[PDB]
Amino acid sequence: RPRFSFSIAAREGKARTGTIEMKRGVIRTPAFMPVGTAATVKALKPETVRATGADIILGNTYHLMLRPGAERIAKLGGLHSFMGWDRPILTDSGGYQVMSLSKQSEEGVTFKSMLSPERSIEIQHLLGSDIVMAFDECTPSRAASSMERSMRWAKRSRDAFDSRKEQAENAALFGIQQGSVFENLRQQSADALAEIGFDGYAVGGLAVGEGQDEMFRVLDFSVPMLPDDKPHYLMGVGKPDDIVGAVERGIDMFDCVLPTRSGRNGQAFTWDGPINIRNARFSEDLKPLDSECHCAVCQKWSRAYIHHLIRAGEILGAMLMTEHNIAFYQQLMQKIRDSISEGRFSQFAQDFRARYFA
Amino acid sequence: RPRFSFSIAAREGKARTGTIEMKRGVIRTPAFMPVGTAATVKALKPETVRATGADIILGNTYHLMLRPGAERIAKLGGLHSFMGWDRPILTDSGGYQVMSLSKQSEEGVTFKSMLSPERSIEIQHLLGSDIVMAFDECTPSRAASSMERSMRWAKRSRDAFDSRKEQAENAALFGIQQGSVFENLRQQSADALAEIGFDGYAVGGLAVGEGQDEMFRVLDFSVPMLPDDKPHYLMGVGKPDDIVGAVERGIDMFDCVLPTRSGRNGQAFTWDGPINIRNARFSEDLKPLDSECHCAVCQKWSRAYIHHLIRAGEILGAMLMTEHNIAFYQQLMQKIRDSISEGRFSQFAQDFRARYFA
Ligand SMILES: Nc1nc2[nH]cnc2c(=O)[nH]1
Ligand SMILES: Nc1nc2[nH]cnc2c(=O)[nH]1
Ligand SMILES: [Zn+2]
Ligand SMILES: [Zn+2]
């Protein structure tokens, strides 16, 4: 099994479909990664996460380092073992969640619940992460200083990873592009990332509230800046329509808490758009969540029952909603993969859109 | 398939083991019924409830009648259909939960979140319950008046059930014995119940705080009062040791929220007694919840992980704890069944006890 081998099987415009082969499994691209925050994809057994078609999950470095602790997890045999998921895991570096969730310096970030690039890579090493993210940071003058520090930290991240042989031979390292919405800075960052060399390139700084029109505009010049021959990862995105539009602009990988979080809150994704299952209109609706969905929830239970469950605050409500929503997301990615491979993605996106917003 | 056929395959002292055959399935006795409060066994899919070995679950008439409503559930195809459990369901009558959970009369009980024997049977009819409980009520003088009203209500329950042909031919009706801790009243009640005739006889009024020594003393004279040839159901009991002692005194059926509720709260049952998984002693314990347990949780996850889950308030923590605890309970009942069939129950109970309290 290769450490990390990205092969593009087909293209359509800027869209790509293909595979990443890793020691613990194959990742089909474009890929959606369910987020497994505290060593769990909320309300799902890992076998269920797999059943939905996920090839890889996301774990959080910030959260695990506090609870239960990275050295504790290593002692316990590593994150794969601990949570019972034996496939690839991508771990975020902690960067984003240290700012928005809790004393900054060139050395790193100090905080309250001393993370640096080196320590970040070490914690991810300890968790036994398959895809390690470089440690990074959150106006033009300011965008460049944040972006410039991150590129320094990416070089630090690179060397720390390379210094750990066990990591170098079995894991992969991704660079994160910053630069806010400025093409010039974005360019700078890709140039610096490319000169360091990484297995994959993320687009950071766009899961921020900017809106889709502006996110797409930034992806429009940003992704062509990245090495074509490596996977392109859009962090923290997104809604089904965000995903389709991002793939149309060259993104191969995605993660988002939307399908899980939303599910627990009553929101179910369908090919005709999201529904809120708690609405009284579903109280006697015997139809499944979505009438095309292949997941186990839609084979077995009605909207009416899941309506009842969620209104009553029952745990099974969250389990069912979450399984469906992750399944939906995986089915979307499969439809994306098949349509690019068949040279009909552009039509798929148009048809998708017409029905989903309708 | 018979409507209701109880066959005793073997006996040891007052203990019995055997089967109840019903249209929707066979019930192995002594049986433990997971409680499925609001049309769900909390944090478990019904396929999982089945996997643990449960043959029958308990649903609550009081709760369902308020949410989502019995006529609504009937319109939706019935409780089996609605929650996706296709095996027997016993529904409690609402009696117990109307008192302790929220204007009394010979007619019935009026309350705030007009239930009578007739309405109770009608609601259970609407839910499509396989085992219907008769409608009943919560000092000697007073015990007899409560007990005496209940026996009147049991006669009303009998006729209401018999008046519904669809119910009479496909469901079963159980009588509930009351009388508090007095042998004389207990006797009275069995005599009245027996004279009406029921498919099964419950012992009500002992899930009350009286303590095990006193509960066992009451079961000591109470169960021999009931028709030998019908199943004997102890409502709302109990801990593993309560169950063993009750079987030793003639009880064939049990329900309790203990394994589910306790599981969500961090308490796991083991053959060496209950543990509280949240205790710091388990933080790095790689052993399963119980080192003999055959359930799927104990095959896959460590105490340490489930410790982490429950401390973090994660939904998967509740799912895993609950699956294990219900599995444990079913394994206990299987051990009980096998030991009576083999004529070594008395020794089983002694060995069980030595280890569990140890
Ligand atoms: N590390 C990191 N994580 C993210 N998640 C969403 N956006 C980002 C980002 O820019 N950096
Ligand atoms: N209906 C009813 N339910 C119970 N659950 C526990 N005890 C009782 C009882 O005495 N009657
Ligand atoms: Zn579905
Ligand atoms: Zn177990």
XYZ file of C-alpha atoms and ligand atoms in Angstrom:
740
model
C 0.000 0.000 0.000
C 1.409 3.428 -0.893
C 1.962 6.084 1.730
C 0.186 8.693 -0.449
C -0.641 8.320 -4.154
C -3.069 10.734 -5.831
C -4.232 9.715 -9.286
C -6.673 11.705 -11.372
C -8.904 9.391 -13.382
C -10.905 11.997 -15.284
C -11.489 15.726 -15.650
C -14.211 18.136 -16.776
C -13.239 21.787 -16.922
C -11.549 22.462 -13.561
C -13.233 19.456 -11.920
C -11.239 16.300 -11.217
C -12.137 12.814 -10.002
C -9.735 10.147 -8.865
C -8.228 8.451 -5.850
C -5.800 8.910 -3.003
C -4.213 5.626 -1.979
C -2.956 5.437 1.587
C -1.712 2.688 3.879
C -5.031 2.436 5.664
C -7.303 2.725 2.635
C -8.353 4.380 -0.568
C -9.955 7.815 -0.694
C -12.271 8.552 -3.602
C -12.138 12.119 -4.796
C -14.004 14.496 -4.668
C -14.294 13.325 -1.078
C -16.414 14.492 1.866
C -14.975 13.928 5.352
C -17.383 13.538 8.250
C -16.060 15.423 11.265
C -15.257 13.391 14.342
C -14.628 16.227 16.773
C -13.838 14.422 20.083
C -12.821 11.002 18.731
C -16.378 10.383 17.568
C -18.541 11.300 14.585
C -21.431 12.474 16.770
C -24.227 9.887 17.243
C -22.684 7.288 14.879
C -20.708 4.100 15.282
C -17.707 4.079 12.953
C -19.193 1.049 11.140
C -22.163 3.259 10.389
C -19.925 6.101 9.206
C -18.381 3.531 6.866
C -21.752 2.212 5.727
C -22.669 5.669 4.490
C -19.672 5.419 2.148
C -17.196 7.647 3.962
C -13.574 6.837 3.089
C -11.872 9.158 5.654
C -12.890 11.187 8.698
C -11.593 14.404 10.294
C -10.395 14.581 13.888
C -9.598 17.814 15.810
C -6.106 18.370 17.293
C -7.249 21.182 19.603
C -10.027 19.206 21.208
C -8.214 15.917 21.574
C -5.173 17.544 23.085
C -7.304 18.768 25.954
C -9.596 15.723 26.197
C -8.403 12.998 26.582
C -4.856 14.198 25.788
C -2.583 13.209 22.920
C -0.019 11.235 24.937
C -2.890 9.427 26.663
C -4.338 8.521 23.288
C -0.933 7.339 22.098
C -0.520 5.248 25.190
C -3.927 3.749 24.455
C -2.766 2.650 21.014
C -3.584 5.712 18.928
C -6.735 7.385 17.624
C -7.631 4.638 15.129
C -7.624 1.989 17.857
C -9.190 4.177 20.523
C -12.314 5.093 18.487
C -12.428 1.964 16.325
C -12.050 3.598 12.884
C -9.310 1.755 10.910
C -9.354 3.926 7.770
C -7.579 7.240 7.044
C -7.952 10.112 9.450
C -7.091 13.725 8.652
C -6.385 15.821 11.732
C -6.651 19.575 11.697
C -3.649 21.336 13.264
C -5.513 23.220 15.979
C -4.848 26.597 14.383
C -8.429 27.656 13.597
C -9.930 26.247 16.783
C -7.422 27.875 19.083
C -8.350 31.386 17.949
C -12.136 31.165 17.611
C -12.569 28.768 20.548
C -10.593 30.285 23.421
C -1.036 34.918 23.589
C 0.210 34.899 19.989
C 3.828 34.992 18.841
C 6.321 33.931 16.181
C 6.931 30.961 18.430
C 3.243 30.117 18.263
C -0.004 30.574 20.170
C -0.376 30.405 23.948
C -3.885 29.810 25.278
C -6.613 29.021 27.758
C -9.267 26.338 27.265
C 1.513 26.584 24.098
C 0.726 25.162 20.668
C 3.384 25.724 18.013
C 3.962 24.139 14.578
C 6.361 21.639 16.185
C 4.016 20.711 18.992
C 1.074 20.551 16.632
C 2.885 18.047 14.405
C 3.949 16.114 17.506
C 0.396 15.824 18.811
C -0.823 14.708 15.383
C 2.041 12.208 15.372
C 0.906 10.976 18.748
C -2.695 10.567 17.601
C -1.414 8.526 14.630
C -3.052 10.780 11.984
C -2.783 9.727 8.296
C -3.113 13.219 6.892
C -1.389 15.858 9.024
C -2.250 19.518 8.543
C 0.425 22.202 8.794
C 0.015 24.648 11.720
C -1.376 27.992 10.579
C -3.035 31.284 11.679
C -6.593 32.676 11.245
C -7.007 44.118 5.653
C -4.299 43.726 3.007
C -1.387 44.793 5.220
C -2.661 42.488 7.912
C -3.644 39.651 5.602
C -0.046 39.413 4.470
C 1.379 39.273 7.987
C -0.975 36.510 8.965
C -0.338 34.759 5.687
C 3.397 35.393 6.049
C 3.591 33.921 9.563
C 1.600 30.893 8.427
C 4.030 30.314 5.613
C 6.845 30.444 8.117
C 4.907 27.990 10.284
C 4.345 25.715 7.275
C 8.098 25.460 6.822
C 8.391 24.695 10.502
C 5.584 22.127 10.083
C 7.365 20.525 7.112
C 10.641 20.058 8.984
C 9.024 18.796 12.172
C 7.167 16.142 10.176
C 10.218 15.184 8.158
C 12.202 14.856 11.373
C 9.880 12.110 12.537
C 10.703 9.105 10.397
C 7.712 7.054 11.514
C 5.557 9.971 10.324
C 7.392 10.690 7.066
C 7.086 7.115 5.850
C 3.479 6.424 6.794
C 1.686 9.781 6.836
C 1.087 12.711 4.480
C 1.424 16.455 5.079
C -0.848 19.216 3.699
C -0.034 22.885 3.281
C -2.659 25.535 3.959
C -3.070 28.582 1.728
C -4.204 31.845 3.377
C -4.225 35.403 2.052
C -7.832 36.343 2.726
C -9.667 37.457 -0.399
C -6.619 38.996 -2.077
C -5.315 37.340 -5.249
C -1.847 38.745 -4.737
C -1.403 37.317 -1.224
C -3.101 34.091 -2.281
C -0.485 33.861 -5.006
C 2.374 34.551 -2.600
C 1.131 31.836 -0.319
C 0.849 29.226 -3.069
C 4.318 30.107 -4.245
C 5.724 29.653 -0.739
C 3.770 26.431 -0.148
C 4.812 25.015 -3.503
C 8.454 25.856 -2.848
C 8.298 23.923 0.407
C 6.448 21.045 -1.210
C 3.479 19.212 0.331
C 1.404 16.109 -0.430
C -1.780 18.213 -0.605
C -2.842 21.866 -0.524
C -5.741 23.272 1.433
C -7.495 26.528 0.867
C -7.812 28.039 4.338
C -9.553 31.254 5.387
C -12.756 30.793 3.447
C -14.948 29.173 6.102
C -15.513 32.616 7.518
C -18.944 34.141 6.773
C -17.972 35.817 3.502
C -20.845 34.302 1.526
C -20.804 31.923 -1.476
C -20.537 34.523 -4.247
C -17.365 35.859 -2.632
C -16.021 32.428 -1.673
C -16.451 31.245 -5.249
C -14.750 34.392 -6.564
C -11.757 33.691 -4.363
C -11.671 30.034 -5.350
C -11.843 31.225 -8.976
C -8.224 32.555 -8.870
C -6.900 30.650 -5.851
C -7.165 27.007 -6.821
C -5.331 27.421 -10.177
C -2.480 28.772 -8.074
C -2.035 25.393 -6.408
C -0.053 22.491 -7.879
C -2.432 20.759 -10.296
C -1.045 17.321 -9.581
C -1.885 17.363 -5.863
C -5.223 17.208 -4.041
C -6.919 20.496 -3.225
C -8.796 20.668 0.106
C -11.381 23.327 1.021
C -11.497 23.434 4.819
C -14.826 23.714 6.625
C -17.093 23.756 3.573
C -20.012 23.216 3.267
C -23.615 23.137 2.122
C -24.365 20.780 -0.776
C -24.428 23.737 -3.194
C -21.110 25.056 -1.830
C -19.595 21.652 -2.517
C -20.854 21.415 -6.097
C -19.592 24.925 -6.903
C -16.256 24.289 -5.275
C -15.737 21.068 -7.242
C -16.527 23.044 -10.395
C -13.563 25.244 -9.404
C -11.045 22.476 -8.692
C -11.511 21.282 -5.104
C -11.034 17.569 -4.342
C -11.689 17.384 -0.576
C -14.182 18.777 1.924
C -15.073 18.664 5.613
C -18.031 20.255 7.454
C -19.931 19.823 10.740
C -23.083 20.871 8.842
C -24.562 17.387 8.151
C -23.992 16.178 11.696
C -24.744 19.342 13.656
C -27.701 20.201 11.439
C -29.055 16.713 11.772
C -29.098 16.868 15.561
C -30.921 20.184 15.215
C -33.682 18.827 13.000
C -32.462 19.734 9.550
C -32.484 17.014 6.885
C -30.898 17.411 3.451
C -32.898 16.347 0.395
C -32.456 16.607 -3.380
C -35.236 19.214 -3.222
C -33.401 21.148 -0.469
C -33.154 20.977 3.301
C -36.241 20.348 5.418
C -36.721 20.918 9.139
C -38.186 17.687 10.364
C -39.675 19.327 13.450
C -42.157 21.298 11.303
C -45.750 20.283 11.966
C -46.200 19.529 8.248
C -44.293 16.233 8.789
C -46.258 14.954 11.789
C -48.188 12.433 9.658
C -45.862 12.185 6.655
C -45.115 8.471 6.014
C -42.576 9.200 3.302
C -38.852 8.829 4.016
C -36.674 11.886 4.637
C -35.808 11.840 0.918
C -37.648 9.715 -1.605
C -34.475 8.833 -3.578
C -32.037 8.278 -0.714
C -30.566 4.790 -0.369
C -29.523 5.081 3.262
C -30.760 2.670 5.969
C -32.861 5.369 7.626
C -34.870 6.074 4.494
C -35.404 2.366 3.942
C -36.904 1.920 7.387
C -38.391 5.013 9.031
C -40.834 7.756 8.190
C -40.539 11.494 8.459
C -43.413 11.246 10.932
C -41.457 8.996 13.323
C -38.265 11.055 13.101
C -40.437 14.185 13.618
C -41.735 12.573 16.810
C -38.244 11.546 17.922
C -36.640 14.947 17.485
C -39.501 16.879 19.093
C -39.243 14.513 22.042
C -35.470 15.096 22.282
C -34.885 11.367 21.857
C -31.343 10.135 21.163
C -32.543 7.952 18.284
C -33.778 11.100 16.555
C -30.242 12.466 16.416
C -28.853 9.081 15.341
C -31.263 8.764 12.428
C -31.021 12.351 11.189
C -27.227 12.186 11.343
C -26.939 8.860 9.509
C -29.240 10.132 6.772
C -27.444 13.456 6.396
C -23.994 11.890 6.138
C -25.352 9.313 3.697
C -26.887 12.121 1.651
C -23.551 13.926 1.542
C -21.742 10.744 0.445
C -24.386 10.088 -2.234
C -23.825 13.642 -3.476
C -20.108 13.045 -3.719
C -20.696 9.760 -5.542
C -22.969 11.551 -8.026
C -20.247 14.151 -8.434
C -17.577 11.523 -9.004
C -19.630 9.536 -11.511
C -20.697 12.622 -13.479
C -17.134 13.937 -13.885
C -15.897 10.507 -14.871
C -18.707 10.411 -17.473
C -18.132 13.942 -18.702
C -21.535 15.214 -17.619
C -20.676 17.049 -14.412
C -21.568 20.454 -15.836
C -25.096 19.220 -16.553
C -25.243 17.504 -13.162
C -24.469 20.714 -11.377
C -27.131 22.609 -13.331
C -29.749 19.905 -12.709
C -28.770 19.610 -9.068
C -29.123 23.325 -8.669
C -32.475 23.588 -10.384
C -34.029 20.983 -8.129
C -32.272 21.865 -4.879
C -33.078 25.566 -4.848
C -36.502 24.973 -6.374
C -48.959 -18.832 14.986
C -50.917 -18.942 18.255
C -52.425 -15.829 19.763
C -50.937 -16.694 23.191
C -49.489 -20.073 24.209
C -47.409 -20.390 27.388
C -45.536 -23.658 27.774
C -43.289 -24.479 30.696
C -40.330 -26.560 29.559
C -38.668 -27.120 32.926
C -38.849 -26.221 36.605
C -36.569 -25.965 39.642
C -38.269 -25.219 42.936
C -40.561 -22.255 42.181
C -38.543 -21.264 39.097
C -39.896 -21.982 35.620
C -38.468 -21.700 32.111
C -40.386 -21.955 28.882
C -41.940 -19.982 26.065
C -44.818 -17.719 25.167
C -45.800 -18.088 21.527
C -47.521 -15.098 19.966
C -48.482 -14.055 16.453
C -45.502 -11.757 16.133
C -42.907 -13.999 17.764
C -41.757 -16.258 20.534
C -40.931 -15.005 24.016
C -38.408 -16.992 26.030
C -39.118 -17.066 29.725
C -37.849 -15.836 32.180
C -37.871 -12.785 29.937
C -36.529 -9.244 30.364
C -38.332 -6.479 28.454
C -36.373 -3.384 27.493
C -38.517 -0.302 28.036
C -39.329 1.780 24.994
C -40.919 4.752 26.723
C -41.801 7.122 23.816
C -41.840 4.624 20.931
C -38.097 4.123 21.291
C -35.749 2.088 23.473
C -33.550 5.091 24.280
C -30.371 5.359 22.147
C -30.937 2.053 20.282
C -32.220 1.052 16.879
C -34.751 -1.766 17.176
C -32.388 -4.036 15.192
C -29.883 -3.436 17.956
C -32.470 -4.169 20.650
C -33.047 -7.444 18.804
C -29.337 -8.173 18.476
C -29.005 -8.094 22.245
C -31.481 -10.990 22.334
C -34.628 -9.170 23.419
C -37.812 -11.002 22.400
C -40.347 -8.290 23.439
C -40.270 -4.634 24.466
C -42.457 -2.469 26.725
C -44.203 0.668 25.504
C -45.963 3.250 27.745
C -49.679 4.045 27.230
C -49.535 7.278 29.249
C -46.679 8.777 27.303
C -47.776 7.746 23.843
C -51.292 8.984 24.383
C -49.941 12.474 24.890
C -47.113 12.284 22.331
C -47.737 11.572 19.485
C -51.294 10.430 20.320
C -52.833 6.979 20.009
C -55.192 7.715 17.105
C -52.300 9.397 15.288
C -50.189 6.300 15.796
C -53.036 4.108 14.572
C -53.461 6.271 11.529
C -49.740 5.871 10.906
C -50.094 2.095 10.855
C -49.642 1.244 14.525
C -46.762 1.208 17.001
C -44.924 -1.740 15.418
C -44.781 0.005 12.043
C -44.151 3.473 13.427
C -41.021 2.525 15.440
C -39.907 -0.395 13.270
C -40.093 -3.188 15.881
C -42.036 -6.163 14.406
C -41.977 -8.425 17.480
C -44.289 -8.492 20.532
C -44.917 -5.317 22.455
C -46.401 -5.166 25.949
C -48.006 -1.828 26.761
C -48.550 -0.682 30.304
C -52.065 0.656 30.956
C -51.090 4.144 32.088
C -52.211 3.525 35.659
C -48.864 3.879 37.457
C -47.604 6.744 35.313
C -50.726 8.830 35.673
C -50.411 9.023 39.459
C -46.660 9.456 39.950
C -46.180 11.565 36.806
C -48.853 14.264 36.952
C -59.092 13.750 39.734
C -59.736 10.129 40.728
C -63.068 8.312 40.641
C -64.835 4.987 40.160
C -65.131 6.060 36.553
C -61.368 6.445 36.391
C -58.627 9.053 36.678
C -58.814 12.595 35.316
C -55.507 14.408 34.859
C -53.088 17.065 33.716
C -49.876 16.376 31.794
C -59.838 11.188 31.422
C -58.245 7.743 31.367
C -60.522 4.870 32.367
C -60.210 1.079 31.953
C -62.233 1.312 28.722
C -60.205 4.149 27.282
C -56.969 2.538 28.374
C -57.835 -0.669 26.511
C -58.924 1.409 23.514
C -55.636 3.299 23.355
C -53.693 0.040 23.650
C -55.915 -1.332 20.889
C -55.076 1.683 18.789
C -51.338 1.269 19.346
C -51.678 -2.379 18.244
C -50.176 -3.815 21.476
C -49.642 -7.616 21.688
C -49.857 -7.808 25.454
C -52.416 -5.408 26.931
C -52.297 -4.577 30.628
C -55.492 -4.118 32.628
C -56.073 -0.579 33.988
C -55.274 -0.342 37.693
C -54.551 2.020 40.641
C -51.352 2.797 42.628
C -52.550 1.101 55.200
C -54.670 -2.058 55.304
C -58.049 -0.308 55.108
C -56.739 1.782 52.261
C -54.826 -1.002 50.546
C -58.071 -2.899 50.149
C -59.957 0.024 48.625
C -57.243 0.614 46.091
C -56.976 -3.094 45.460
C -60.771 -3.371 45.354
C -61.182 -0.584 42.781
C -58.436 -2.116 40.651
C -60.223 -5.428 40.680
C -63.351 -3.666 39.530
C -61.288 -1.967 36.823
C -59.794 -5.324 35.799
C -63.289 -6.627 35.136
C -63.974 -3.496 33.150
C -60.650 -4.050 31.334
C -61.566 -7.673 30.563
C -64.914 -6.777 28.999
C -63.573 -3.840 27.009
C -60.905 -6.091 25.494
C -63.332 -8.908 24.808
C -65.670 -6.443 23.124
C -63.019 -5.681 20.538
C -62.838 -8.745 18.332
C -59.684 -7.676 16.512
C -58.050 -7.449 19.954
C -59.473 -10.658 21.429
C -58.223 -12.790 18.557
C -54.741 -11.344 18.154
C -53.738 -9.918 21.538
C -53.428 -11.105 25.141
C -54.650 -9.502 28.371
C -52.839 -9.473 31.749
C -54.349 -8.942 35.176
C -52.490 -6.956 37.817
C -52.405 -8.032 41.459
C -52.267 -5.281 44.117
C -52.807 -5.447 47.872
C -49.633 -3.765 49.075
C -47.622 -5.944 51.437
C -50.635 -7.699 52.960
C -51.049 -11.423 52.280
C -54.773 -11.273 52.882
C -55.436 -8.528 50.312
C -52.942 -10.109 47.927
C -54.997 -13.273 48.221
C -58.272 -11.445 47.618
C -56.841 -9.867 44.523
C -55.586 -13.144 43.058
C -58.939 -14.718 43.737
C -60.737 -11.896 41.926
C -58.251 -11.889 39.033
C -58.436 -15.656 38.677
C -62.230 -15.578 38.680
C -62.165 -13.095 35.819
C -59.514 -15.060 33.968
C -56.493 -13.536 32.205
C -53.709 -14.725 29.894
C -51.063 -13.575 32.399
C -50.836 -12.180 35.932
C -48.643 -9.319 37.031
C -47.563 -8.496 40.517
C -48.117 -4.749 40.812
C -47.290 -2.439 43.719
C -43.803 -3.693 44.431
C -41.750 -1.237 42.376
C -42.162 1.229 45.190
C -39.066 1.729 47.386
C -39.860 -1.021 49.887
C -36.460 -2.694 49.580
C -35.527 -6.204 48.366
C -35.916 -8.062 51.668
C -39.512 -6.843 51.883
C -40.218 -7.265 48.164
C -38.998 -10.850 48.325
C -41.113 -11.499 51.429
C -44.188 -10.305 49.581
C -43.333 -12.332 46.498
C -42.865 -15.312 48.843
C -46.658 -15.594 49.487
C -47.989 -13.640 46.504
C -46.802 -15.572 43.481
C -48.144 -18.963 44.705
C -51.507 -17.217 44.821
C -51.467 -16.772 41.053
C -52.529 -19.433 38.541
C -49.490 -21.686 38.104
C -50.199 -22.346 34.454
C -49.970 -18.696 33.381
C -46.997 -16.330 33.142
C -46.194 -14.226 36.188
C -44.933 -10.673 35.523
C -43.152 -8.473 38.088
C -43.647 -4.885 36.936
C -40.775 -2.406 37.105
C -38.128 -4.744 38.513
C -35.149 -4.563 38.562
C -31.481 -4.878 39.426
C -29.806 -8.115 38.318
C -30.008 -9.467 41.885
C -33.702 -8.518 42.145
C -34.326 -10.498 38.976
C -32.509 -13.627 40.145
C -34.357 -13.601 43.485
C -37.688 -12.993 41.836
C -37.194 -15.895 39.418
C -36.371 -18.068 42.431
C -39.856 -17.127 43.689
C -41.799 -17.831 40.490
C -41.644 -14.751 38.252
C -41.424 -15.253 34.472
C -41.332 -11.666 33.142
C -39.612 -8.390 33.986
C -39.295 -4.802 32.785
C -37.069 -1.979 34.105
C -35.648 1.355 32.897
C -32.542 0.580 34.992
C -30.260 -0.784 32.209
C -31.095 2.028 29.813
C -31.352 4.957 32.217
C -28.344 3.788 34.211
C -26.339 3.347 31.064
C -26.914 6.926 29.949
C -25.815 7.986 33.429
C -22.520 6.114 33.332
C -23.361 2.914 35.140
C -22.345 -0.371 33.505
C -23.432 -3.786 34.777
C -20.804 -6.516 35.116
C -20.705 -10.043 36.552
C -18.608 -8.521 39.351
C -21.217 -5.778 39.947
C -21.999 -2.376 38.491
C -19.212 0.068 37.673
C -19.444 3.801 37.034
C -17.525 4.290 33.846
C -16.917 7.970 34.569
C -14.616 7.095 37.500
C -11.034 8.180 36.888
C -9.867 4.595 37.498
C -11.081 3.704 33.959
C -9.372 6.533 32.070
C -6.642 4.215 30.735
C -8.370 0.848 31.150
C -8.193 -1.017 27.795
C -10.382 -3.867 28.989
C -14.003 -4.114 27.832
C -16.856 -3.093 30.132
C -17.109 -6.750 31.198
C -14.490 -9.336 30.348
C -17.057 -12.115 29.700
C -19.730 -10.141 27.852
C -20.453 -11.178 24.266
C -22.080 -7.938 23.164
C -20.784 -5.875 20.208
C -19.594 -3.077 22.487
C -17.325 -5.348 24.498
C -15.929 -6.853 21.316
C -14.917 -3.461 19.981
C -14.400 -0.689 22.537
C -12.504 -0.128 25.745
C -13.633 1.175 29.085
C -11.188 4.019 28.471
C -12.959 5.150 25.279
C -16.445 4.872 26.777
C -15.103 6.754 29.849
C -13.996 9.520 27.483
C -17.313 9.498 25.619
C -19.524 9.762 28.681
C -17.427 12.449 30.380
C -17.621 14.429 27.155
C -21.422 14.016 27.036
C -21.120 12.381 23.621
C -24.164 10.608 22.162
C -22.095 7.537 21.279
C -21.314 7.133 24.974
C -24.997 6.652 25.746
C -25.444 4.343 22.744
C -22.603 2.058 23.793
C -23.416 1.925 27.505
C -27.063 1.204 26.717
C -26.344 -1.556 24.193
C -23.978 -3.228 26.644
C -26.366 -2.970 29.584
C -29.317 -4.420 27.683
C -27.078 -7.167 26.311
C -25.886 -7.902 29.843
C -29.475 -8.181 31.044
C -30.367 -10.539 28.174
C -27.264 -12.658 28.866
C -28.377 -12.873 32.499
C -31.797 -14.076 31.453
C -30.243 -16.625 29.098
C -28.054 -17.912 31.943
C -31.175 -18.099 34.078
C -33.098 -19.988 31.414
C -30.305 -22.472 30.720
C -29.636 -23.151 34.411
C -33.293 -23.901 35.222
C -33.597 -26.108 32.171
C -30.466 -27.953 33.383
C -31.590 -28.165 36.988
C -28.748 -26.047 38.334
C -30.464 -22.702 38.836
C -30.116 -22.818 42.615
C -26.338 -23.095 42.250
C -26.349 -20.422 39.544
C -28.060 -17.970 41.814
C -25.600 -18.649 44.638
C -22.589 -18.316 42.319
C -24.031 -15.228 40.678
C -24.549 -13.673 44.053
C -21.109 -14.469 45.386
C -19.397 -12.815 42.449
C -21.782 -9.907 41.914
C -21.805 -8.600 45.468
C -18.139 -9.461 45.954
N -6.463 24.988 10.230
C -7.496 25.507 9.619
N -8.646 24.964 9.755
C -9.799 25.516 9.094
N -11.047 25.116 9.102
C -11.731 25.936 8.353
N -10.969 26.825 7.880
C -9.627 26.598 8.345
C -8.291 27.182 8.223
O -8.139 28.178 7.535
N -7.312 26.589 8.873
N -49.669 -0.471 35.799
C -48.690 -0.662 36.645
N -47.485 -0.451 36.271
C -46.390 -0.653 37.183
N -45.102 -0.496 37.000
C -44.503 -0.801 38.118
N -45.356 -1.139 38.985
C -46.673 -1.063 38.413
C -48.068 -1.289 38.791
O -48.323 -1.664 39.923
N -48.986 -1.072 37.872
Zn -31.695 8.752 3.770
Zn -20.851 -5.904 26.741
